[PDB]
Amino acid sequence: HPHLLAERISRLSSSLEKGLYERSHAIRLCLLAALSGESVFLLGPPGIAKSLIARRLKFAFQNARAFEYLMTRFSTPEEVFGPLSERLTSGYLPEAEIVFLDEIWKAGPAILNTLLTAINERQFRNGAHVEKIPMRLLVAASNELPEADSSLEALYDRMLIRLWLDKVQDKANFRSMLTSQQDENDNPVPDALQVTDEEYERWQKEIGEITLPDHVFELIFMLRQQLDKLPDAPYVSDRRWKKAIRLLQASAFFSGRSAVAPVDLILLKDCLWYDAQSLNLIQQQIDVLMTGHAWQQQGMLTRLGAIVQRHLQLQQQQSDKTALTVIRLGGIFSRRQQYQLPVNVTASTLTLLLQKPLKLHDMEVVHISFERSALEQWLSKGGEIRGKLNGIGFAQKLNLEVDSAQHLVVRDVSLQGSTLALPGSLPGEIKQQLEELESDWRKQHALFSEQQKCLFIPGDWLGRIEASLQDVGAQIRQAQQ
């Protein structure tokens, strides 16, 4: 039964996209809010099918009435909620399933105050007695943004989904859109896919019954605390966080799941933002968490470094078995020229360990990676040599010199000797920790391959999640070589 619900949802939104190109993310987002009791906000220039999406969502229900109205600067509540005689509200707002209000940032104070009670209380002051409003979807479109210190910020903070629609950009999608014979005022949804009034009331009770896993709560609290530290991050109140769960729980219910999936966090990119400045910051902060802590991408990166650091620690501890002998050469030269090992070492950026660790450049080190192109010139001509610390940073100058037993001695600021050594030709402890980390990567990748078929997820976002999971699996495979 729960698996068959995802087929009807995927087939319902497919018929709604007939005639509307490059608007897949706008239809699937409005359909989820219409079946959950939420709202949606549209922003863009006038002329991007911002009014057809309001009239197309009424076809998904058996008994749904549309309402198109343009809010003006001199608009009166008698023209929106019906004039009084006790109020002639025949086909207006109190008895409408889907209402459309264009340019909401310019209405009067009387209409804005009455619109707040229709969302929270879902009622209307009809003179004396009050009556409920079966508003299933509220869409508001405009063109500009309201002021930062005005009374219009109350309605903007209550609107959950905030979409920034624009014109078409693809050339192939513009030819079929410019010559579309599909009528915009027709019914392109079959009767078998239309939901009834009994199914809408039953789904509202099953939405709040979705369990909240402990792994999803750690991602919501981390994203909330990250925005409180950045000064340029938009402030997210408790109402925005609570209402975002109703859209996230319903995203998995209509897709064939019983719990909240971590893939549903991508829908927060069109709710937390509020202007042009917060658009580039919300989409960037969520993309980091979606490709870092969502599928344990960054959690396994910091754990993999501990295994590499443990492998280098065990190699420098057993460095007393293999030394570093430097062979000599004859010839006629004024300086004592030295030669390195022939076939024993052939790498260019080889690493050389050390016994007693020292403090170089006010920091500790466990291995110094030298260059084969510069080691031959120092052992023959002489002078000074360079070398980075711990295989990172710039090639800093060291106090390298020769010893009486044909060895390399590295001195610091206290004239401390340290004989270098090369690593010999995988321990059991390193292979045990590497096998456990590789099993967690396969289990995390299996969860993404079982929930990526969600209808409320964009297609361009799937390319970044797969690329981030492959980078972690490619780094763990190089250490076991």
Ligand X SMILES: Nc1ncnc2c1ncn2[C@@H]1O[C@H](COP(=O)(O)OP(=O)(O)O)[C@@H](O)[C@H]1O
Binding site for ligand X (CB under 6 A): 19-23, 46-52, 168, 177, 184, 238-239, 242
Among 5, 110, 112, 245, contact with a copy of itself (rule: CB under 8 A): 245
What is the pattern of x (binds a copy of itself, CB under 8 A) and - over residues 97-136? -----xx--x---------xx--xxx--x-xx--------
Closest approach, Cβ 184 to ligand X, in A, equals 4
Among 87, 188, 241, 355, contact with a copy of itself (rule: CB under 8 A): 241
Closest approach, Cβ 442 to ligand X, in A, equals 42
Closest approach, Cβ 21 to ligand X, in A, equals 5
Q: Give the whole-angstrom CA distance, residue 343 versus residue 345.
A: 5
Coil/strand/helix, residue 447: helix
In the complex with a copy of itself, the residue whose CB is nearer, 128 or 392, is: 128
In the complex with ligand X, the residue whose CB is nearer, 76 or 173, is: 173
Beta-strand ranges (E) seen in 116-174 are 123-125, 130-132, 137-141, 161-164
Closest approach, Cβ 209 to a copy of itself, in A, equals 8
User: Does 391 carry a binding-site annotation?
Assistant: no
Q: Which does 392 bind (CB under 5 to 8 A by kind): a copy of itself, ligand X, none?
A: none
- If one asks whether residue 167 binds a copy of itself (CB under 8 A), the answer comes out as yes
Give the orientation angle of helix 276-290 with respect to helix 462-479, to 10 degrees: 40
Residues 66-85 that bind a copy of itself (CB under 8 A): 68, 70, 72-73
Q: Give the whole-angstrom CA distance, residue 22 versus residue 407.
A: 69
Q: Give the whole-angstrom CA distance, residue 289 versus residue 203.
A: 30
Closest approach, Cβ 87 to a copy of itself, in A, equals 14
Closest approach, Cβ 31 to a copy of itself, in A, equals 22
Dihedral of alpha carbons 155, 157, 158, 161, sign: positive
* DSSP symbols for 71-131: --TT--HHHHS--B--B--TTSSTT-SEEEEE--TT--HHHHHHHHHHHHT-EEE-SSSEE
Closest approach, Cβ 34 to ligand X, in A, equals 18
Q: Compute the residue count for the chain.
A: 481
Asked whether 390 and 351 are in contact (CB, 8 A), the reply is: no
User: Does 21 carry a binding-site annotation?
Assistant: yes
User: Does 274 carry a binding-site annotation?
Assistant: no
What's 359's DSSP letter? Answer: B
Q: Give the whole-angstrom CA distance, residue 28 versus residue 23.
A: 9
In the complex with ligand X, the residue whose CB is nearer, 168 or 462, is: 168
User: Does 49 carry a binding-site annotation?
Assistant: yes
Closest approach, Cβ 155 to ligand X, in A, equals 11
User: Does 339 carry a binding-site annotation?
Assistant: no
Terminus-to-terminus CA distance in the chain, angstroms? 48
What is the pattern of x (binds a copy of itself, CB under 8 A) and - over residues 34-73? -----------xxxxx-x----------------x-x-xx
Structure tokens at 473: 């699996």
Structure tokens at 291: 């490709």
The stretch near a copy of itself (CB under 8 A) out of 145-153, 320-328, 375-383, 462-470 is 145-153
CA dihedral 190, 191, 194, 197 (to 10 degrees): 160
Question: Which residue from 66, 55, 52, 45 is spatially nearest to 21, judged by alpha carbons?
Answer: 52
What's 361's DSSP letter? Answer: S
Q: Which does 19 bind (CB under 5 to 8 A by kind): ligand X, a copy of itself, none?
A: ligand X
In the complex with ligand X, the residue whose CB is nearer, 6 or 141, is: 141
Cα separation values, 13 from 60, 351, 441, 456, Å: 9, 59, 34, 10
In the complex with a copy of itself, the residue whose CB is nearer, 227 or 350, is: 227
Give the orientation angle of helix 297-317 with respect to helix 462-479, to 10 degrees: 10
Among 175, 356, 431, 453, contact with a copy of itself (rule: CB under 8 A): 175
Other Cβ atoms less than 10 A from the Cβ of 397: the count is: 10
Cα 424 vs. chain centroid, distance in angstroms? 43
In the complex with ligand X, the residue whose CB is nearer, 179 or 414, is: 179
Structure tokens at 404: 């009486």
Closest approach, Cβ 434 to ligand X, in A, equals 51
Closest approach, Cβ 187 to ligand X, in A, equals 15
Asked whether 80 and 69 are in contact (CB, 8 A), the reply is: yes
In the complex with ligand X, the residue whose CB is nearer, 224 or 407, is: 224
User: Does 258 carry a binding-site annotation?
Assistant: no
In the complex with a copy of itself, the residue whose CB is nearer, 6 or 160, is: 160
Q: Give the whole-angstrom CA distance, residue 54 versus residue 25.
A: 14
In the complex with a copy of itself, the residue whose CB is nearer, 91 or 305, is: 91
Other Cβ atoms less than 10 A from the Cβ of 331: the count is: 6
In the complex with ligand X, the residue whose CB is nearer, 46 or 393, is: 46
Contacts with a copy of itself by CB under 8 A lie at 45-49, 51, 68, 70, 72-73, 90-91, 102-103, 106, 116-117, 120-122, 125, 127-128, 150-151, 153-154, 157, 167-168, 171, 174-175, 177-181, 184-185, 208-209, 212, 217, 220-221, 235, 237-242, 245
The binding site comprises 21, 47-52, 184
